[model samples]
Target: PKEMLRAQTNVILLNVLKQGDNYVYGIIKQVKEASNGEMELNEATLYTIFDRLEQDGIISSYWGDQGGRRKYYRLTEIGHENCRLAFESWSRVRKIIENLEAN
Candidate 1:
Protein backbone atom coordinates (compact mmCIF):
# COMPACT_ATOMS: atom_id res chain seq x y z
CA PRO A 1 0.00 0.00 0.00
CA LYS A 2 2.80 2.36 0.86
CA GLU A 3 4.57 1.58 -2.37
CA MET A 4 1.39 2.09 -4.32
CA LEU A 5 0.87 5.44 -2.68
CA ARG A 6 4.40 6.46 -3.53
CA ALA A 7 3.81 5.49 -7.15
CA GLN A 8 0.65 7.52 -7.15
CA THR A 9 2.48 10.60 -5.89
CA ASN A 10 5.23 10.11 -8.44
CA VAL A 11 2.67 9.85 -11.19
CA ILE A 12 0.97 13.02 -10.01
CA LEU A 13 4.20 15.00 -9.94
CA LEU A 14 5.39 13.69 -13.28
CA ASN A 15 2.08 14.44 -14.90
CA VAL A 16 2.22 17.97 -13.57
CA LEU A 17 5.63 18.37 -15.13
CA LYS A 18 4.36 17.03 -18.42
CA GLN A 19 1.32 19.26 -18.41
CA GLY A 20 3.34 22.33 -17.46
CA ASP A 21 1.48 24.76 -15.19
CA ASN A 22 -1.70 23.07 -14.00
CA TYR A 23 -4.37 23.44 -11.38
CA VAL A 24 -5.42 20.92 -8.75
CA TYR A 25 -8.55 19.72 -10.49
CA GLY A 26 -6.71 19.40 -13.75
CA ILE A 27 -4.06 17.27 -12.11
CA ILE A 28 -6.70 15.09 -10.53
CA LYS A 29 -8.40 14.62 -13.86
CA GLN A 30 -5.17 13.61 -15.54
CA VAL A 31 -4.35 11.23 -12.73
CA LYS A 32 -7.75 9.58 -13.03
CA GLU A 33 -7.34 9.16 -16.76
CA ALA A 34 -3.81 7.81 -16.40
CA SER A 35 -4.90 5.33 -13.78
CA ASN A 36 -7.91 4.31 -15.87
CA GLY A 37 -10.22 5.49 -13.11
CA GLU A 38 -8.75 3.05 -10.64
CA MET A 39 -7.40 5.88 -8.58
CA GLU A 40 -9.57 8.71 -7.34
CA LEU A 41 -8.04 11.46 -5.25
CA ASN A 42 -10.12 14.04 -3.41
CA GLU A 43 -9.42 17.76 -3.49
CA ALA A 44 -8.23 17.81 0.11
CA THR A 45 -5.86 14.97 -0.55
CA LEU A 46 -4.48 16.70 -3.61
CA TYR A 47 -4.02 19.94 -1.70
CA THR A 48 -2.14 18.14 1.04
CA ILE A 49 0.02 16.33 -1.48
CA PHE A 50 0.81 19.57 -3.26
CA ASP A 51 1.72 21.27 -0.03
CA ARG A 52 4.07 18.46 0.93
CA LEU A 53 5.70 18.43 -2.48
CA GLU A 54 6.18 22.19 -2.36
CA GLN A 55 7.70 21.90 1.09
CA ASP A 56 10.06 19.22 -0.17
CA GLY A 57 11.24 21.52 -2.98
CA ILE A 58 9.94 19.14 -5.61
CA ILE A 59 7.31 21.57 -6.86
CA SER A 60 6.36 25.22 -6.77
CA SER A 61 2.89 26.72 -6.54
CA TYR A 62 1.43 30.06 -7.48
CA TRP A 63 -1.88 31.73 -7.92
CA GLY A 64 -3.31 32.46 -11.35
CA ASP A 65 -6.21 34.18 -13.06
CA GLN A 66 -7.49 37.64 -12.37
CA GLY A 67 -9.81 36.41 -9.66
CA GLY A 68 -7.07 34.28 -8.11
CA ARG A 69 -9.48 31.38 -8.00
CA ARG A 70 -6.99 28.94 -9.39
CA LYS A 71 -3.69 27.77 -7.96
CA TYR A 72 -1.18 26.41 -10.43
CA TYR A 73 1.76 24.13 -9.80
CA ARG A 74 4.93 23.41 -11.71
CA LEU A 75 7.91 21.16 -11.35
CA THR A 76 11.18 22.57 -10.03
CA GLU A 77 14.62 21.44 -11.17
CA ILE A 78 14.76 19.01 -8.28
CA GLY A 79 11.32 17.74 -9.21
CA HIS A 80 12.45 17.04 -12.75
CA GLU A 81 15.42 15.05 -11.50
CA ASN A 82 13.20 13.19 -9.06
CA CYS A 83 10.74 12.41 -11.83
CA ARG A 84 13.47 10.91 -13.97
CA LEU A 85 14.67 8.82 -11.07
CA ALA A 86 11.15 7.68 -10.33
CA PHE A 87 10.64 6.69 -13.94
CA GLU A 88 13.79 4.58 -13.94
CA SER A 89 12.85 2.89 -10.70
CA TRP A 90 9.35 2.10 -11.92
CA SER A 91 10.66 0.91 -15.25
CA ARG A 92 12.87 -1.63 -13.54
CA VAL A 93 9.95 -2.86 -11.44
CA ARG A 94 7.79 -3.11 -14.54
CA LYS A 95 10.38 -5.19 -16.33
CA ILE A 96 10.63 -7.54 -13.34
CA ILE A 97 6.87 -7.92 -13.24
CA GLU A 98 6.74 -8.65 -16.94
CA ASN A 99 9.42 -11.30 -16.59
CA LEU A 100 7.56 -12.90 -13.72
CA GLU A 101 4.34 -12.98 -15.73
CA ALA A 102 6.08 -14.52 -18.74
CA ASN A 103 7.52 -17.40 -16.73
Candidate 2:
Protein backbone atom coordinates (compact mmCIF):
# COMPACT_ATOMS: atom_id res chain seq x y z
CA PRO A 1 0.00 0.00 0.00
CA LYS A 2 2.83 2.34 0.83
CA GLU A 3 4.42 1.78 -2.57
CA MET A 4 1.15 2.24 -4.39
CA LEU A 5 0.45 5.39 -2.45
CA ARG A 6 3.94 6.55 -3.26
CA ALA A 7 3.30 6.06 -6.96
CA GLN A 8 0.04 8.01 -6.73
CA THR A 9 1.87 10.66 -4.79
CA ASN A 10 4.47 10.83 -7.54
CA VAL A 11 1.78 11.24 -10.18
CA ILE A 12 -0.03 13.97 -8.31
CA LEU A 13 3.01 16.05 -7.48
CA LEU A 14 4.47 15.77 -10.95
CA ASN A 15 1.17 16.80 -12.46
CA VAL A 16 1.16 19.85 -10.25
CA LEU A 17 4.81 20.70 -10.73
CA LYS A 18 4.63 20.33 -14.47
CA GLN A 19 2.49 23.42 -14.65
CA GLY A 20 4.92 25.62 -12.71
CA ASP A 21 7.34 25.81 -9.81
CA ASN A 22 6.01 25.83 -6.25
CA TYR A 23 7.04 25.81 -2.62
CA VAL A 24 6.15 23.45 0.19
CA TYR A 25 3.15 25.06 1.81
CA GLY A 26 2.07 26.44 -1.52
CA ILE A 27 1.97 22.92 -2.87
CA ILE A 28 0.15 21.72 0.21
CA LYS A 29 -2.59 24.22 -0.46
CA GLN A 30 -2.70 23.30 -4.12
CA VAL A 31 -3.14 19.64 -3.37
CA LYS A 32 -5.64 20.33 -0.62
CA GLU A 33 -7.81 22.45 -2.86
CA ALA A 34 -7.48 20.00 -5.71
CA SER A 35 -8.47 17.13 -3.48
CA ASN A 36 -11.25 19.14 -1.85
CA GLY A 37 -9.70 18.74 1.63
CA GLU A 38 -9.55 14.99 1.24
CA MET A 39 -5.74 15.02 1.13
CA GLU A 40 -2.81 16.69 2.78
CA LEU A 41 0.82 15.89 3.38
CA ASN A 42 2.93 15.41 6.43
CA GLU A 43 5.79 17.87 6.11
CA ALA A 44 8.19 15.06 6.85
CA THR A 45 6.61 12.87 4.21
CA LEU A 46 6.82 15.58 1.57
CA TYR A 47 10.48 16.09 2.34
CA THR A 48 10.98 12.38 1.90
CA ILE A 49 9.60 12.57 -1.59
CA PHE A 50 11.61 15.70 -2.21
CA ASP A 51 14.71 13.87 -1.18
CA ARG A 52 14.17 11.03 -3.61
CA LEU A 53 13.11 13.28 -6.45
CA GLU A 54 16.08 15.56 -6.07
CA GLN A 55 18.43 12.65 -5.84
CA ASP A 56 17.03 11.14 -8.99
CA GLY A 57 17.10 14.47 -10.83
CA ILE A 58 13.35 14.28 -11.20
CA ILE A 59 13.09 17.72 -9.61
CA SER A 60 15.24 20.64 -8.64
CA SER A 61 14.92 23.13 -5.80
CA TYR A 62 16.24 26.47 -4.66
CA TRP A 63 15.28 29.01 -2.04
CA GLY A 64 12.75 31.51 -3.36
CA ASP A 65 14.47 34.33 -1.43
CA GLN A 66 11.13 35.29 0.02
CA GLY A 67 9.72 34.90 3.52
CA GLY A 68 13.19 33.72 4.61
CA ARG A 69 12.54 29.95 4.59
CA ARG A 70 10.84 28.58 1.56
CA LYS A 71 12.33 26.27 -1.07
CA TYR A 72 10.67 26.11 -4.46
CA TYR A 73 10.81 23.13 -6.76
CA ARG A 74 10.67 22.88 -10.53
CA LEU A 75 10.84 19.96 -12.85
CA THR A 76 14.12 19.31 -14.66
CA GLU A 77 14.50 18.44 -18.36
CA ILE A 78 14.55 14.74 -17.55
CA GLY A 79 11.76 15.42 -15.12
CA HIS A 80 9.58 16.55 -17.97
CA GLU A 81 10.10 13.26 -19.75
CA ASN A 82 9.50 11.16 -16.66
CA CYS A 83 6.53 13.28 -15.75
CA ARG A 84 5.03 12.62 -19.15
CA LEU A 85 5.66 8.91 -18.97
CA ALA A 86 4.39 8.59 -15.44
CA PHE A 87 0.99 9.82 -16.53
CA GLU A 88 0.94 7.59 -19.54
CA SER A 89 1.75 4.57 -17.40
CA TRP A 90 -0.74 5.47 -14.70
CA SER A 91 -3.51 6.24 -17.13
CA ARG A 92 -2.94 2.93 -18.84
CA VAL A 93 -3.42 1.23 -15.52
CA ARG A 94 -6.46 3.38 -14.91
CA LYS A 95 -7.96 2.12 -18.15
CA ILE A 96 -7.07 -1.46 -17.26
CA ILE A 97 -8.79 -1.19 -13.91
CA GLU A 98 -11.84 0.68 -15.09
CA ASN A 99 -13.20 -2.44 -16.67
CA LEU A 100 -12.53 -4.70 -13.70
CA GLU A 101 -16.17 -4.73 -12.55
CA ALA A 102 -16.75 -7.74 -14.80
CA ASN A 103 -14.95 -9.83 -12.24
Candidate 3:
Protein backbone atom coordinates (compact mmCIF):
# COMPACT_ATOMS: atom_id res chain seq x y z
CA PRO A 1 0.00 0.00 0.00
CA LYS A 2 3.05 2.29 0.00
CA GLU A 3 6.14 3.00 -1.98
CA MET A 4 8.20 2.52 1.16
CA LEU A 5 11.53 1.83 -0.47
CA ARG A 6 11.39 5.22 -2.15
CA ALA A 7 10.66 6.82 1.18
CA GLN A 8 13.24 4.88 3.17
CA THR A 9 16.47 6.87 3.01
CA ASN A 10 14.63 10.16 2.58
CA VAL A 11 13.19 9.49 6.01
CA ILE A 12 16.61 8.67 7.38
CA LEU A 13 18.21 11.78 5.95
CA LEU A 14 15.44 14.02 7.22
CA ASN A 15 15.41 12.53 10.71
CA VAL A 16 19.18 12.68 11.03
CA LEU A 17 19.35 16.37 10.18
CA LYS A 18 16.40 17.04 12.43
CA GLN A 19 18.58 16.04 15.37
CA GLY A 20 21.33 18.37 14.12
CA ASP A 21 23.18 19.54 11.05
CA ASN A 22 25.87 17.31 9.58
CA TYR A 23 28.15 17.05 6.59
CA VAL A 24 28.12 14.36 3.95
CA TYR A 25 30.41 11.88 5.65
CA GLY A 26 28.88 12.48 9.04
CA ILE A 27 25.49 11.68 7.66
CA ILE A 28 26.66 8.44 6.13
CA LYS A 29 28.47 7.49 9.29
CA GLN A 30 25.61 8.26 11.65
CA VAL A 31 23.09 6.42 9.55
CA LYS A 32 25.34 3.39 9.49
CA GLU A 33 25.80 3.63 13.22
CA ALA A 34 22.12 4.29 13.76
CA SER A 35 21.33 1.11 11.93
CA ASN A 36 24.09 -0.73 13.76
CA GLY A 37 26.32 -1.07 10.68
CA GLU A 38 23.64 -2.57 8.49
CA MET A 39 22.98 0.42 6.23
CA GLU A 40 26.15 1.47 4.47
CA LEU A 41 25.14 4.47 2.39
CA ASN A 42 27.52 4.86 -0.50
CA GLU A 43 28.74 8.39 -1.15
CA ALA A 44 27.02 8.34 -4.51
CA THR A 45 23.80 7.17 -2.92
CA LEU A 46 24.01 9.86 -0.27
CA TYR A 47 24.76 12.56 -2.80
CA THR A 48 21.86 11.49 -4.90
CA ILE A 49 19.54 11.88 -1.96
CA PHE A 50 21.05 15.25 -1.13
CA ASP A 51 20.50 16.59 -4.60
CA ARG A 52 16.97 15.32 -4.52
CA LEU A 53 16.30 16.84 -1.11
CA GLU A 54 17.43 20.27 -2.19
CA GLN A 55 15.44 20.15 -5.38
CA ASP A 56 12.44 19.08 -3.35
CA GLY A 57 13.01 21.97 -0.89
CA ILE A 58 13.44 19.59 2.02
CA ILE A 59 17.00 20.62 2.93
CA SER A 60 19.76 23.10 2.32
CA SER A 61 23.54 23.17 2.62
CA TYR A 62 26.19 25.74 3.41
CA TRP A 63 29.94 25.42 3.65
CA GLY A 64 32.63 26.25 6.24
CA ASP A 65 30.69 26.56 9.44
CA GLN A 66 32.41 25.93 12.81
CA GLY A 67 32.77 22.28 11.91
CA GLY A 68 35.12 22.79 8.93
CA ARG A 69 35.27 23.62 5.20
CA ARG A 70 33.20 20.67 4.17
CA LYS A 71 29.61 21.23 3.07
CA TYR A 72 27.05 20.96 5.87
CA TYR A 73 23.35 20.16 5.53
CA ARG A 74 20.28 21.01 7.57
CA LEU A 75 16.57 20.57 7.29
CA THR A 76 14.02 23.19 6.28
CA GLU A 77 10.70 23.71 8.08
CA ILE A 78 9.13 21.59 5.37
CA GLY A 79 11.65 18.91 6.15
CA HIS A 80 10.90 19.07 9.86
CA GLU A 81 7.21 18.74 9.11
CA ASN A 82 7.78 15.96 6.62
CA CYS A 83 10.13 14.11 8.95
CA ARG A 84 7.26 13.31 11.29
CA LEU A 85 4.84 12.72 8.45
CA ALA A 86 7.37 10.51 6.75
CA PHE A 87 7.53 8.17 9.71
CA GLU A 88 3.79 8.35 10.15
CA SER A 89 3.23 6.33 7.01
CA TRP A 90 5.52 3.58 8.18
CA SER A 91 4.30 3.73 11.75
CA ARG A 92 0.72 3.53 10.61
CA VAL A 93 1.45 0.45 8.58
CA ARG A 94 3.37 -1.04 11.45
CA LYS A 95 0.44 -0.58 13.78
CA ILE A 96 -1.88 -2.11 11.24
CA ILE A 97 0.35 -5.14 10.85
CA GLU A 98 0.71 -5.51 14.58
CA ASN A 99 -3.03 -5.39 14.97
CA LEU A 100 -3.41 -7.98 12.25
CA GLU A 101 -0.92 -10.26 13.96
CA ALA A 102 -2.65 -9.81 17.28
CA ASN A 103 -5.96 -10.81 15.78
Candidate 4:
Protein backbone atom coordinates (compact mmCIF):
# COMPACT_ATOMS: atom_id res chain seq x y z
CA PRO A 1 0.00 0.00 0.00
CA LYS A 2 2.81 2.40 0.77
CA GLU A 3 4.44 1.60 -2.55
CA MET A 4 1.18 2.08 -4.36
CA LEU A 5 0.69 5.44 -2.70
CA ARG A 6 4.19 6.51 -3.64
CA ALA A 7 3.67 5.48 -7.22
CA GLN A 8 0.42 7.39 -7.28
CA THR A 9 2.19 10.44 -5.89
CA ASN A 10 4.84 10.14 -8.57
CA VAL A 11 2.18 10.13 -11.26
CA ILE A 12 0.47 13.13 -9.76
CA LEU A 13 3.74 14.95 -9.32
CA LEU A 14 4.78 14.28 -12.88
CA ASN A 15 1.48 15.46 -14.24
CA VAL A 16 1.68 18.63 -12.22
CA LEU A 17 5.27 19.22 -13.18
CA LYS A 18 4.32 18.75 -16.80
CA GLN A 19 1.94 21.62 -16.41
CA GLY A 20 4.89 23.97 -15.82
CA ASP A 21 8.00 24.44 -13.76
CA ASN A 22 6.93 24.88 -10.17
CA TYR A 23 8.47 25.47 -6.81
CA VAL A 24 8.23 22.77 -4.15
CA TYR A 25 5.35 24.38 -2.34
CA GLY A 26 3.24 24.77 -5.46
CA ILE A 27 4.01 21.22 -6.48
CA ILE A 28 2.98 19.97 -3.09
CA LYS A 29 -0.25 21.92 -3.10
CA GLN A 30 -1.15 20.91 -6.64
CA VAL A 31 -0.41 17.26 -5.99
CA LYS A 32 -2.39 17.23 -2.77
CA GLU A 33 -5.31 18.99 -4.40
CA ALA A 34 -5.20 16.74 -7.42
CA SER A 35 -5.20 13.68 -5.22
CA ASN A 36 -8.17 15.18 -3.34
CA GLY A 37 -6.00 15.81 -0.27
CA GLU A 38 -5.38 12.10 0.26
CA MET A 39 -1.68 12.65 -0.26
CA GLU A 40 -0.35 14.47 2.74
CA LEU A 41 3.28 14.29 1.73
CA ASN A 42 5.56 16.21 4.09
CA GLU A 43 8.49 18.41 3.05
CA ALA A 44 11.08 15.81 3.87
CA THR A 45 9.30 13.04 2.01
CA LEU A 46 8.72 15.30 -0.95
CA TYR A 47 12.30 16.49 -1.22
CA THR A 48 13.70 13.04 -0.55
CA ILE A 49 11.70 11.46 -3.36
CA PHE A 50 12.52 14.41 -5.60
CA ASP A 51 16.21 14.03 -4.86
CA ARG A 52 16.04 10.36 -5.76
CA LEU A 53 14.23 11.14 -8.98
CA GLU A 54 16.67 13.91 -9.85
CA GLN A 55 19.62 11.65 -9.20
CA ASP A 56 18.02 9.03 -11.41
CA GLY A 57 17.93 11.76 -14.13
CA ILE A 58 14.19 11.69 -14.11
CA ILE A 59 13.81 15.34 -13.13
CA SER A 60 15.75 18.56 -12.80
CA SER A 61 15.65 21.52 -10.47
CA TYR A 62 16.25 25.25 -10.84
CA TRP A 63 15.66 28.28 -8.70
CA GLY A 64 12.68 30.39 -9.55
CA ASP A 65 10.75 33.17 -7.91
CA GLN A 66 7.36 32.48 -6.43
CA GLY A 67 5.87 35.46 -4.61
CA GLY A 68 9.39 36.80 -4.07
CA ARG A 69 10.62 33.58 -2.51
CA ARG A 70 13.04 31.28 -4.30
CA LYS A 71 11.67 27.87 -5.29
CA TYR A 72 12.66 25.07 -7.66
CA TYR A 73 11.65 21.84 -9.44
CA ARG A 74 11.19 20.65 -13.00
CA LEU A 75 10.61 17.41 -14.86
CA THR A 76 12.72 15.89 -17.57
CA GLU A 77 11.87 13.80 -20.62
CA ILE A 78 12.88 10.70 -18.68
CA GLY A 79 10.51 11.73 -15.93
CA HIS A 80 7.61 11.67 -18.34
CA GLU A 81 8.64 8.20 -19.46
CA ASN A 82 8.85 7.08 -15.87
CA CYS A 83 5.39 8.42 -15.27
CA ARG A 84 4.10 6.45 -18.24
CA LEU A 85 5.72 3.27 -17.03
CA ALA A 86 4.37 3.76 -13.52
CA PHE A 87 0.85 4.17 -14.86
CA GLU A 88 1.14 1.11 -17.02
CA SER A 89 2.33 -1.02 -14.13
CA TRP A 90 -0.37 0.34 -11.84
CA SER A 91 -3.04 -0.37 -14.44
CA ARG A 92 -2.02 -4.01 -14.59
CA VAL A 93 -2.03 -4.32 -10.84
CA ARG A 94 -5.45 -2.78 -10.67
CA LYS A 95 -6.85 -5.16 -13.21
CA ILE A 96 -5.43 -8.16 -11.45
CA ILE A 97 -6.83 -6.97 -8.13
CA GLU A 98 -10.24 -6.45 -9.65
CA ASN A 99 -10.20 -9.90 -11.19
CA LEU A 100 -9.25 -11.50 -7.91
CA GLU A 101 -11.98 -9.62 -6.10
CA ALA A 102 -14.56 -10.61 -8.67
CA ASN A 103 -13.61 -14.27 -8.64
Candidate 5:
Protein backbone atom coordinates (compact mmCIF):
# COMPACT_ATOMS: atom_id res chain seq x y z
CA PRO A 1 0.00 0.00 0.00
CA LYS A 2 1.10 3.54 -0.68
CA GLU A 3 1.53 6.16 1.97
CA MET A 4 -1.79 7.96 2.20
CA LEU A 5 -0.45 11.44 2.70
CA ARG A 6 2.98 11.45 1.26
CA ALA A 7 3.60 14.15 -1.36
CA GLN A 8 3.92 12.02 -4.46
CA THR A 9 3.07 14.64 -7.04
CA ASN A 10 6.74 15.40 -7.43
CA VAL A 11 7.26 11.97 -8.91
CA ILE A 12 4.62 12.66 -11.53
CA LEU A 13 6.25 15.96 -12.28
CA LEU A 14 9.61 14.24 -12.63
CA ASN A 15 8.15 11.69 -15.00
CA VAL A 16 6.66 14.40 -17.11
CA LEU A 17 10.07 15.92 -17.51
CA LYS A 18 11.48 12.55 -18.44
CA GLN A 19 9.17 12.19 -21.42
CA GLY A 20 11.02 14.77 -23.44
CA ASP A 21 13.65 17.49 -23.44
CA ASN A 22 12.68 20.63 -21.57
CA TYR A 23 14.18 23.64 -19.91
CA VAL A 24 13.31 25.10 -16.52
CA TYR A 25 10.84 27.67 -17.75
CA GLY A 26 9.43 25.14 -20.19
CA ILE A 27 8.71 22.72 -17.38
CA ILE A 28 7.24 25.44 -15.20
CA LYS A 29 5.02 26.52 -18.04
CA GLN A 30 3.89 23.02 -19.03
CA VAL A 31 3.17 21.88 -15.48
CA LYS A 32 1.31 25.05 -14.60
CA GLU A 33 -0.73 24.91 -17.75
CA ALA A 34 -1.35 21.17 -17.66
CA SER A 35 -2.65 21.52 -14.12
CA ASN A 36 -4.77 24.48 -15.17
CA GLY A 37 -2.92 26.28 -12.38
CA GLU A 38 -4.54 23.96 -9.85
CA MET A 39 -1.16 22.55 -8.84
CA GLU A 40 -0.17 26.03 -7.67
CA LEU A 41 3.51 25.26 -7.58
CA ASN A 42 5.47 28.10 -6.10
CA GLU A 43 9.12 28.82 -6.76
CA ALA A 44 10.08 27.40 -3.39
CA THR A 45 8.40 24.07 -4.04
CA LEU A 46 9.91 23.84 -7.49
CA TYR A 47 13.42 24.70 -6.37
CA THR A 48 13.20 22.35 -3.42
CA ILE A 49 12.42 19.46 -5.75
CA PHE A 50 15.29 20.45 -7.98
CA ASP A 51 17.68 20.48 -5.04
CA ARG A 52 16.50 17.13 -3.78
CA LEU A 53 16.66 15.50 -7.21
CA GLU A 54 20.14 16.84 -7.74
CA GLN A 55 21.28 15.50 -4.40
CA ASP A 56 19.74 12.15 -5.21
CA GLY A 57 21.77 12.11 -8.39
CA ILE A 58 18.54 11.83 -10.33
CA ILE A 59 19.03 15.01 -12.25
CA SER A 60 21.74 17.43 -13.28
CA SER A 61 21.44 21.15 -13.92
CA TYR A 62 23.70 23.56 -15.70
CA TRP A 63 23.50 27.00 -17.21
CA GLY A 64 22.34 27.05 -20.80
CA ASP A 65 24.70 28.10 -23.57
CA GLN A 66 22.50 31.07 -24.44
CA GLY A 67 24.35 33.79 -22.47
CA GLY A 68 21.18 34.64 -20.56
CA ARG A 69 22.18 32.47 -17.60
CA ARG A 70 19.31 30.12 -18.14
CA LYS A 71 19.62 26.86 -16.25
CA TYR A 72 18.54 23.56 -17.77
CA TYR A 73 17.81 20.36 -15.90
CA ARG A 74 18.08 16.88 -17.35
CA LEU A 75 17.40 13.45 -15.98
CA THR A 76 20.28 11.17 -15.08
CA GLU A 77 20.40 7.37 -15.09
CA ILE A 78 19.18 7.37 -11.52
CA GLY A 79 16.17 9.35 -12.63
CA HIS A 80 15.15 6.52 -14.97
CA GLU A 81 15.30 4.15 -12.02
CA ASN A 82 13.21 6.49 -9.92
CA CYS A 83 10.61 6.85 -12.66
CA ARG A 84 10.32 3.10 -13.06
CA LEU A 85 9.91 2.59 -9.32
CA ALA A 86 7.29 5.30 -8.98
CA PHE A 87 5.30 3.98 -11.92
CA GLU A 88 5.35 0.41 -10.71
CA SER A 89 4.40 1.35 -7.16
CA TRP A 90 1.57 3.59 -8.19
CA SER A 91 0.23 1.04 -10.64
CA ARG A 92 0.13 -1.57 -7.91
CA VAL A 93 -1.74 0.75 -5.57
CA ARG A 94 -4.21 1.70 -8.25
CA LYS A 95 -4.90 -1.92 -9.07
CA ILE A 96 -5.52 -2.67 -5.42
CA ILE A 97 -7.97 0.19 -5.18
CA GLU A 98 -9.76 -1.03 -8.29
CA ASN A 99 -10.01 -4.52 -6.89
CA LEU A 100 -11.50 -3.18 -3.68
CA GLU A 101 -14.07 -1.20 -5.59
CA ALA A 102 -15.16 -4.33 -7.47
CA ASN A 103 -16.13 -6.10 -4.26
Candidate 6:
Protein backbone atom coordinates (compact mmCIF):
# COMPACT_ATOMS: atom_id res chain seq x y z
CA PRO A 1 0.00 0.00 0.00
CA LYS A 2 2.86 2.34 0.85
CA GLU A 3 4.53 1.62 -2.46
CA MET A 4 1.26 2.18 -4.28
CA LEU A 5 0.82 5.50 -2.52
CA ARG A 6 4.29 6.63 -3.50
CA ALA A 7 3.70 5.66 -7.11
CA GLN A 8 0.40 7.51 -7.10
CA THR A 9 2.05 10.65 -5.84
CA ASN A 10 4.76 10.40 -8.46
CA VAL A 11 2.15 9.98 -11.19
CA ILE A 12 0.22 12.96 -9.86
CA LEU A 13 3.32 15.11 -9.97
CA LEU A 14 4.14 13.90 -13.45
CA ASN A 15 0.64 14.66 -14.61
CA VAL A 16 0.99 18.21 -13.35
CA LEU A 17 4.18 18.60 -15.31
CA LYS A 18 2.60 17.18 -18.42
CA GLN A 19 -0.35 19.54 -18.18
CA GLY A 20 1.84 22.51 -17.40
CA ASP A 21 0.93 24.80 -14.50
CA ASN A 22 -2.46 24.06 -12.95
CA TYR A 23 -4.60 24.36 -9.84
CA VAL A 24 -5.54 21.50 -7.52
CA TYR A 25 -8.99 20.87 -8.92
CA GLY A 26 -7.70 20.89 -12.47
CA ILE A 27 -4.96 18.49 -11.58
CA ILE A 28 -7.39 16.24 -9.80
CA LYS A 29 -9.65 16.17 -12.83
CA GLN A 30 -6.75 15.34 -15.09
CA VAL A 31 -5.66 12.56 -12.76
CA LYS A 32 -9.11 11.06 -12.74
CA GLU A 33 -9.28 11.05 -16.52
CA ALA A 34 -5.78 9.66 -16.86
CA SER A 35 -6.50 6.82 -14.46
CA ASN A 36 -9.94 6.19 -15.96
CA GLY A 37 -11.41 6.82 -12.51
CA GLU A 38 -9.53 3.91 -10.99
CA MET A 39 -7.87 6.34 -8.57
CA GLU A 40 -9.64 8.73 -6.30
CA LEU A 41 -7.85 11.44 -4.33
CA ASN A 42 -9.21 13.52 -1.50
CA GLU A 43 -8.60 17.25 -1.45
CA ALA A 44 -6.81 17.23 1.86
CA THR A 45 -4.48 14.43 0.83
CA LEU A 46 -3.66 16.18 -2.41
CA TYR A 47 -3.00 19.45 -0.62
CA THR A 48 -0.72 17.75 1.89
CA ILE A 49 1.26 16.07 -0.86
CA PHE A 50 1.49 19.36 -2.75
CA ASP A 51 2.80 21.09 0.37
CA ARG A 52 5.43 18.43 0.92
CA LEU A 53 6.55 18.52 -2.70
CA GLU A 54 6.81 22.32 -2.64
CA GLN A 55 8.84 22.25 0.55
CA ASP A 56 11.16 19.68 -0.94
CA GLY A 57 11.78 22.07 -3.89
CA ILE A 58 10.36 19.52 -6.30
CA ILE A 59 7.43 21.82 -7.08
CA SER A 60 6.46 25.46 -6.62
CA SER A 61 3.10 27.11 -6.11
CA TYR A 62 1.60 30.55 -6.39
CA TRP A 63 -1.79 32.12 -6.05
CA GLY A 64 -3.69 32.66 -9.29
CA ASP A 65 -5.16 36.03 -10.13
CA GLN A 66 -8.43 34.53 -11.40
CA GLY A 67 -9.26 33.89 -7.76
CA GLY A 68 -7.14 34.49 -4.73
CA ARG A 69 -8.24 31.10 -3.44
CA ARG A 70 -6.93 29.20 -6.43
CA LYS A 71 -3.29 28.24 -6.12
CA TYR A 72 -1.37 26.94 -9.11
CA TYR A 73 1.56 24.54 -9.02
CA ARG A 74 4.34 23.73 -11.47
CA LEU A 75 7.36 21.50 -11.57
CA THR A 76 10.81 22.83 -10.93
CA GLU A 77 13.97 21.63 -12.68
CA ILE A 78 14.54 19.27 -9.78
CA GLY A 79 10.99 18.04 -10.21
CA HIS A 80 11.60 17.13 -13.85
CA GLU A 81 14.62 15.13 -12.77
CA ASN A 82 12.64 13.56 -9.98
CA CYS A 83 9.93 12.56 -12.45
CA ARG A 84 12.52 10.86 -14.65
CA LEU A 85 13.93 8.93 -11.74
CA ALA A 86 10.49 7.95 -10.51
CA PHE A 87 9.54 6.59 -13.93
CA GLU A 88 12.73 4.59 -14.12
CA SER A 89 12.19 3.15 -10.66
CA TRP A 90 8.58 2.27 -11.35
CA SER A 91 9.46 0.63 -14.62
CA ARG A 92 12.12 -1.52 -12.97
CA VAL A 93 9.76 -2.57 -10.21
CA ARG A 94 7.03 -3.40 -12.71
CA LYS A 95 9.41 -5.58 -14.69
CA ILE A 96 10.39 -7.45 -11.53
CA ILE A 97 6.77 -7.96 -10.58
CA GLU A 98 5.95 -9.25 -14.03
CA ASN A 99 8.87 -11.66 -13.99
CA LEU A 100 7.95 -12.94 -10.56
CA GLU A 101 4.37 -13.51 -11.64
CA ALA A 102 5.50 -15.22 -14.81
CA ASN A 103 7.73 -17.64 -12.91
Q: Which predicted model would earn the best TM-score?
A: 2
lDDT string for model 6 (30-83, tens) is: 888878998766678878787888889988888788436688888888988877
Q: Write one digit per residue (lDDT tens) for candidate 4, span 2-103.
A: 899888777677777888788787777876887798876787877878889899997898766526656677889887777788789999999999999999
Clashing residue pairs found in predicted model 3: none
Estimate, for each residue in 1-103, the C-alpha lDDT of model 1 and write its tens digit: 9878867686765676666988878888887898899977788877777778789998897888665679888888898887788889999999999999999
Who wins the lDDT comparison? Answer: 2
- Please report, as a residue range, the 10-residue window in candidate 3 with the lowest summed lDDT: 1-10
Model 5 earns a TM-score of 0.69
Expressed as tens digits, the lDDT of each residue in 1-103 for candidate 5 is 2343125667655766688655767777787888898765566666877888789898888777746777778888788887788789999999999999999
The all-Cα superposition gives candidate 1 an RMSD in Å to the true structure of 3.9
Predict model 3's lDDT versus the native: 0.85
Badly placed stretches (over 4 Å) of model 4 are 65-69, 81-103
Q: What are the lDDT scores of the predictions, listed in order?
A: 0.80, 0.87, 0.85, 0.80, 0.75, 0.80
TM-score of candidate 6 relative to the true fold: 0.69
TM-score of each: 0.66, 0.77, 0.72, 0.68, 0.69, 0.69
Off by over 4 Å in 3: 1-3, 84-103
What are the clashing pairs of model 2? none
Residue by residue across 24-94, what tens digits does model 2's lDDT show? 88888999999999988777788899899999999999877735767889999999987678779999998
Over 1-103, each residue of candidate 3 has an lDDT whose tens digit, in order, gives 2367657877777779989988889889898898999988888877888898899998998985454589989899998878678689989999999999998
Q: Residue 36's C-alpha lDDT in candidate 4?
A: 95
Ten contiguous residues with the weakest lDDT in model 5: 1-10
Better of 3 and 6 by lDDT: 3
- Candidate 4: which pairs clash? none
